[PDB]
């Protein structure tokens, strides 16, 4: 059952990362605050 929770938390990881990237893109889409790419 632990392997099942690990496999499902992998999906939790990927969907949480998708949400994080989507919110980052949104925040960087405000013309009010100019943004700079690292390096």
């Amino acid at each position: 059952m632990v392997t099942q929770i690990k496999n499902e938390l992998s999906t939790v990881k990927t969907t949480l990362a998708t949400i994080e990237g989507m919110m980052a893109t949104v925040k960087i889409m405000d013309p009010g605050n100019p943004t700079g790419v690292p390096v």
């Binding site: 990927t14 990362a17 990237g21």
Partner: protein, 1368 residues
């Protein structure tokens, strides 16, 4: 100096309504202008304005009192008079009435001179074309097959050009323009006397001033005022009308269009009188109605007539918006407009796109132009996050796939996001292609994927970008300096503030005069964030000339730092990242561009010679895209481009800077309506201001927008599972939707299936474009199963439709260049006639027209002299003898004449050696009777001019004949040396040298003073040497009218140079007088040369004799190339005919075949299979070792060494000299030079918008085979032969002909021809002169590279050389 900087001859600036209003209110001129018509000018205190500018008021008051005296009823106020005062757009139906036939003699003399000169060459020109046809086909009806009707000769062409309608109007307005320009020159000089001209002709009174023209017609009782710019528009438009009507009268191909064009002109002229400036809306609607009528005959029922009906609705809206016409009247007017477009072939419906500029241009106002951009911008726009992220994911996929297709098939440095699946991790690890179906699935991870630094791009990578002049705005603190001082003086006085300083600096001059200019520090302006804080930044628009559509009526200008940053960013994008996406087909190479366009258009045209293929084409207009781009939709693309380039923040600069600044339209006669708004920041969003524009500007950051559009097109194609081939070009994008259909299906059903397949793709594309914020309307998109539009040219069923009338409408009587020589104008006319030949007009008619208008231009320049001369002996000698005019106009340009169009130019664009072609045409004219053999003897026996070693090598194929180069080129060169010697920039530190001319003369002597002279080799080696690179960089300068004026101001010409530039035309005519007057006494060995001698032999003798002073009898080799027409002895085989060259000995030929049963605009199955025709072959190295990332200097040095070794020899001293000459540009040692240099065998010696060479109507069905031929001069010769044969086949079936009831065969035998010759070269010629002391810009990176090879590269090249030496 004022006799060089003459006022414009043609229109190049926008027409301003308020300028005319200012000039008619300053002098209190009679007018029926309403108070709102004047706008801000009604509130001016004209008394103070009249008190100042005393001379202008004197002239305007003189014009007013004369108008009152001649017409007493003009005093009648409150419009109780019957005289009507009409502004420009409302005088269209009266322009034929304004005729000063009496009290005007110069146009009459010009017409009689042109007639008498043309009458002496018409029969000779007819014989010339008859002989050309007889040689090229063996039959005398090559040019008259389609028309045989009436065959118009040069005499007929002249008669119908001078006796047409608009001829009297074009003579009257030519006189008006001539007098106005004379008055302007006199006023600028400072005469201040007799600056008012009155013609007082019966029924048409005209008063001309340097600033206004008062025109009154008694027949219509209408009085109008025209400013100088409006006078230039009217005379350009009337010349265009004359040209279009006369060509429709002359050509049997355009004959059906004459009546329709006449009725269209009449109807829209009355509509113009009725409405005013809104008739240009109707004109712009007709612009699209041409395409709407073109798609009215497609097989698909569900797409037939949609655009037609929608455009009819929009024209009804435009006619009923002001309630000028009721619904019934508007419908009747629409029917009258439409009836002129129906029952025409597709080619003619496209050639009704000439009428666009036949009605002039609207009077522009800053407020009206600003309203359109204030609404596209500053407007709320909703966008879809997912649509932006999906197109961003596809953008990343295309970038990665392009970087894989280059750089040895490896992924860019990338960092996968935390959401990436296992499959994406494996594809990154394996460096495998990202299939678009995979991307559409996992678009949440293909995106959010940070591509790291991929390019070692530098701002100073390209120098040509920094040396182009771009309009720059004034600093914000003084933004009112654009406006006229008179209008703003009082509003500034009432505010107790100083008058703003006028701004006249240019970007080029500002960049040139910078002691500390580093492109890295220039880009730091944007990168550091200083641009968003600069209080000096100011951007403004300005009215755009020669535009009739509401959109695109303005162009923007920025400050110097932000223009430099913009050009640097655009260069960075266009060189590294723009190259990575080639999902579209547009490339800088025009040849493969049009080849790709033809292939794209011919997708669905498959014959019967299972499943087949079908195509539905979609065309979208992207003009309003620039105003609709928003930061929130571009920031992710900008961020990933910044990451790939290493810049923290560069590309998302336009929107960020625009939202924080107030824009405005800068027109000197359009000040703000409110005089209390003296600062840009506090301005409101009205009048001429555009407060905080959220969008982008046209042209600016276009690479990023084009890349986003390509990504969106690919996303939409993948979403619909449809194959497409986009051809995005910034303004117009063309998409060829492709689907698979049953072969046995009917053509109509095949196209219906193609449209049904394309429906889903079009819906997806509309949804995607709306998601990224671009709403697609019915006007923009054009869905058709037959044609698409690219670069304003339509691709209809495997053809490019002609649109020759558009080209003929811009064939005027003078060039806009400053020198205003006769040679420049004749060259312009020849270029336009070349366009006419390429656009389907009869080649015989085009040749006759070229001769006629060259004669017409020379006669006009003779009888309308730009500058007064004390001695008129030359002008009288040319005027009193029209035979001299004819001889000069028929003489080819290379020999000193004005005939810039060659007989071979009718067929081949690529001419090779122009002197051989000129000699061939001289022979043709001599044998027909146009010229005389003693003219050829005079040219051969001509005394050598003033030429140096630099002139023989700078431009080969040229003779030592004086005055061959126009004064325009001299002015351009003077401006470039005057700017280069003024340059103090860190870049170009060592480019300029005072003894550069002497060094180039010594180097040209080094290359040329050998046993055999090879001007091609000298030209190449010079162009790839340090001196030649400095010449090239100095030639990178723009040489613009403003730049030329600045050069003449800061560096005045000497008195002798002033006089020679002013009287170049008279000196050139006097120079020709020695050859085109009488038979001179010539040396006797010239009697061997006859009209039967091959043109190559005569070219050899003529170049040997011309440069005799320079070369002392030594020959010139490597130049001559056989003339295309004279090389081939063609034969057309018809039915029972048998080829006469094959039947008699000769067996070398290029076989051409056209199948029978072809019907254009008919079922593709019936006619034979189609294919992309032969349109040309550009350059296509096998070096010892291939170097990757080689610098420009390294490539130039390798080119120099290879050419030197191939031409002069392969001894050890021939290698030492080449090594030194390369050492003027690189730092390689002798061993690696020898090793890296490409093969010195068969050196091509190749040395250096959308204009197709033909319509490719019947040339797409033509079979070609050189199986009976030998086959790098020979390759070019045979390509020329194939192109000539294709053009011959195409002129056999002219655009009037659309069928092929018989199969034809063309042989085109090049064998048994005197012109083809053996080739011997690559002998050892050592230098008879020591190597000159070549000064070298060692420090300058753009000329010399201290480290062109890396340590690893040096090791690899040494290993390769050692392996070759040992391995053998």
């Amino acid at each position: 100096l004022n006799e060089i900087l003459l006022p414009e001859v043609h229109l190049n600036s926008p027409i301003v309504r308020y300028k005319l209003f200012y000039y008619i209110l300053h002098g209190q001129l009679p007018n029926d202008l309403e108070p709102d018509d004047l706008g801000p000018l009604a509130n001016q205190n004209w008394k103070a304005i009249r008190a100042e500018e005393s001379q202008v008021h004197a002239r305007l008051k003189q014009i007013r009192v004369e108008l009152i005296a001649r017409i007493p009823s003009l005093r009648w106020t409150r419009s109780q008079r019957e005289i009507a005062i009409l502004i420009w757009p409302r005088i269209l139906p009266i322009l034929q009435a304004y005729d000063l036939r009496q009290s005007m003699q110069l146009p009459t003399v010009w017409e009689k001179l042109t007639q008498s000169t043309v009458n002496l060459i018409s029969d000779g020109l007819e014989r010339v074309v008859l002989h050309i046809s007889n040689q090229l086909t063996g039959k005398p009806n090559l040019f008259t097959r389609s028309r045989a009707y009436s065959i118009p000769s040069t005499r007929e062409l002249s008669q119908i050009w001078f006796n047409n309608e608009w001829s009297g109007s074009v003579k009257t307005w030519l006189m008006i323009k001539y007098r106005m320009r004379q008055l302007i020159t006199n006023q600028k000089t400072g005469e201040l006397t007799d600056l008012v001209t009155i013609v007082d002709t019966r029924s048409t009174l005209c008063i001309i001033t340097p600033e206004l023209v008062a025109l009154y017609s008694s027949e219509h009782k209408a009085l109008t005022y025209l400013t100088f710019e409006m006078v230039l528009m009217v005379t350009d438009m009337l010349e265009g009308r004359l040209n279009v009507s006369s060509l429709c009268t002359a050509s049997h191909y355009l004959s059906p269009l004459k009546k329709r064009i006449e009725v269209l002109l009449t109807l829209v002229d009355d509509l113009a009188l009725l409405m005013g400036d809104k008739v240009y809306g109707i004109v712009s609607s007709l612009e699209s109605f041409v395409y709407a009528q073109l798609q009215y005959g497609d097989p698909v029922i569900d797409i037939k007539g949609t655009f037609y009906g929608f455009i009819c609705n929009e024209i009804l809206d435009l006619l009923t918006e002001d309630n000028i016409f009721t619904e019934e009247e508007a419908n009747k007017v629409l029917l009258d407009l439409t009836s002129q477009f129906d029952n025409l072939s597709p080619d003619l419906t496209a050639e009704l796109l000439c009428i666009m500029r036949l009605w002039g241009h609207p009077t522009l106002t800053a407020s009206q132009a600003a309203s359109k951009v204030r609404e596209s911008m500053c407007a709320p726009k909703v966008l879809d996050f997912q649509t932006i992220m999906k197109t961003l994911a596809f953008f990343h996929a295309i970038l990665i796939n392009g970087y894989r297709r280059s750089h040895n098939g490896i992924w860019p440095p990338t960092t996968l996001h935390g959401n990436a699946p296992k499959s994406l991790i494996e594809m990154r690890h394996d460096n495998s292609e990202l299939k678009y179906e995979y991307v559409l699935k996992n678009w949440k991870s293909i995106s959010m994927l940070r591509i790291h630094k991929c390019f070692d791009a530098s701002p100073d990578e390209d120098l040509s970008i920094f040396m182009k002049d771009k309009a720059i705005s004034c600093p914000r603190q003084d933004w009112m300096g654009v406006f006229r001082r008179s209008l703003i003086k009082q509003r500034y006085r009432d505010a107790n503030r100083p008058l703003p300083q006028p701004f006249n600096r240019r970007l080029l001059l500002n960049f040139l005069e910078d002691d500390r200019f580093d492109p890295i520090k220039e880009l730091e302006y944007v990168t550091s964030g200083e641009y968003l804080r600069d209080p000096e930044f100011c951007a403004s628009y300005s009215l755009k000339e020669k535009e009739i559509k509401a959109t695109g009526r303005i162009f923007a200008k920025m400050t110097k730092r932000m223009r430099s940053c913009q050009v640097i960013a655009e260069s960075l994008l266009a060189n590294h990242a723009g190259k990575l996406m080639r999902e579209n087909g547009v490339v800088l190479d025009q040849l493969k561009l049009t080849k790709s366009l033809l292939t794209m258009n011919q997708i669905g045209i498959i014959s019967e010679h299972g499943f087949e293929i079908a195509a539905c084409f979609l065309t979208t207009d992207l003009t309003k895209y620039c105003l609709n781009w928003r930061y929130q939709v571009i920031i992710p693309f900008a961020r990933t481009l910044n990451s790939m380039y290493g810049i923290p923040h560069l590309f998302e600069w336009i929107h960020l800077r625009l939202m924080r600044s107030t824009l405005y339209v800068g027109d000197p006669f359009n000040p703000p309506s409110d005089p209390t708004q003296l600062d840009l920041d506090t301005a409101l969003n009205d009048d001429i201001f555009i407060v905080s524009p959220r969008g982008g500007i046209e042209g600016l950051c276009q690479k990023l927008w084009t890349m986003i559009s390509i990504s969106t097109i690919i996303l939409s194609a993948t979403e619909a599972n449809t194959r497409v081939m986009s051809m995005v070009q910034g303004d117009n994008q063309a998409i060829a939707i492709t689907t698979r259909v049953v072969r046995s299906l009917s053509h109509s059903e095949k196209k219906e299936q193609a449209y049904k397949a394309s429906k889903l793709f079009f819906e997806r594309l509309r949804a995607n474009n709306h998601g990224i914020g671009h709403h697609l309307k019915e006007q923009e998109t054009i869905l058709s199963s037959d044609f698409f539009i690219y670069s304003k040219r339509v691709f209809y069923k495997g053809r490019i439709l002609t649109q020759a009338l558009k080209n003929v409408s811009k064939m005027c009587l003078t060039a806009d260049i400053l020198g205003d020589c006769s040679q420049a104008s004749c060259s312009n006319l020849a270029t336009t006639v070349m366009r006419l030949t390429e656009n389907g007009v009869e080649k015989d008619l085009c040749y006759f027209l070229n001769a006629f208008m060259t004669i017409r231009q020379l006669c006009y320049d003779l009888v309308f002299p730009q500058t007064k001369s004390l001695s008129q002996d030359i002008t009288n000698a040319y005027l009193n003898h029209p035979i001299l005019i004819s001889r000069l106009c028929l003489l080819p340009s290379q020999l000193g004449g004005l005939n810039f169009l060659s007989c071979s130019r009718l067929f081949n664009r690529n001419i090779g050696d122009p002197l051989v072609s000129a000699i061939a045409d001289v022979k043709r004219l001599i044998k027909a009777g146009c010229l005389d053999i003693w003219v050829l003897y005079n040219i051969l026996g001509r005394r050598p001019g003033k030429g140096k070693w630099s002139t023989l090598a700078a431009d080969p194929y040229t003779l030592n004949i004086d005055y061959l180069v126009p004064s325009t080129t001299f002015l351009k060169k003077h401006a470039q040396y005057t700017l280069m010697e003024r340059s103090v920039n860190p870049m170009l530190r060592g480019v300029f040298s005072e003894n550069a001319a002497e060094e180039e003369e010594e180097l040209a002597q080094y290359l040329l003073d050998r046993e055999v002279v090879m001007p091609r080799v000298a030209h190449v080696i010079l162009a790839q040497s340090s001196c030649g690179r400095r010449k090239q960089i100095q030639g990178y300068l723009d040489s613009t009218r403003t730049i030329i004026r600045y050069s003449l101001e800061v560096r005045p010409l000497s008195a002798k140079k002033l006089n020679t530039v002013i009287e170049y035309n008279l000196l050139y005519l006097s120079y020709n007088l020695e050859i085109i007057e009488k038979p001179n006494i010539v040396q006797p060995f010239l009697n061997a040369i006859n009209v039967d001698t091959c043109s190559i032999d005569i070219a050899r003798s003529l170049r040997k004799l011309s440069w005799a002073t320079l070369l002392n009898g030594r020959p010139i080799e490597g130049l001559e190339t056989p003339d295309p027409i004279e090389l081939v002895h063609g034969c057309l085989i018809i039915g029972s005919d048998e080829c006469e060259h094959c039947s008699s000995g000769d067996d070398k030929f290029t076989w051409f075949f056209l199948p029978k049963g072809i019907r254009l605009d008919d079922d593709p199955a019936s006619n034979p299979p189609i294919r992309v025709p032969y349109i040309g072959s550009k350059t296509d190295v096998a070096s010892m070792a291939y170097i990757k990332g080689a610098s420009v200097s390294l490539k130039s040095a390798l080119r120099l060494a290879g050419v030197y070794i191939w031409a002069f020899g392969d001894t050890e001293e021939s290698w030492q000299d080449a090594y030194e000459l390369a050492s003027t540009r690189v730092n390689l040692t002798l061993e690696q030079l020898q090793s890296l240099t490409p093969l010195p065998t068969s050196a091509n010696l190749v040395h250096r918008k959308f204009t197709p060479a033909s319509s490719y109507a019947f040339s797409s069905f033509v079979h070609i085979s050189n199986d009976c031929q030998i086959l790098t001069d020979s390759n070019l010769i045979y390509q020329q032969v194939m192109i000539t044969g294709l053009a011959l086949i195409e002129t056999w079936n002219n655009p009037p002909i659309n069928f092929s009831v018989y199969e034809t065969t063309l042989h085109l035998h090049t064998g048994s021809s005197c012109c083809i010759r053996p080739v011997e070269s690559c002998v050892v010629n050592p230098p008879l002169l020591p190597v000159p002391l070549i000064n070298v810009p060692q420090m300058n990176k753009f000329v010399y590279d201290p480290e062109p090879l890396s340590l690893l590269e040096m090791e690899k090249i040494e290993d390769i050389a050692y392996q070759t030496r040992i391995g053998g």
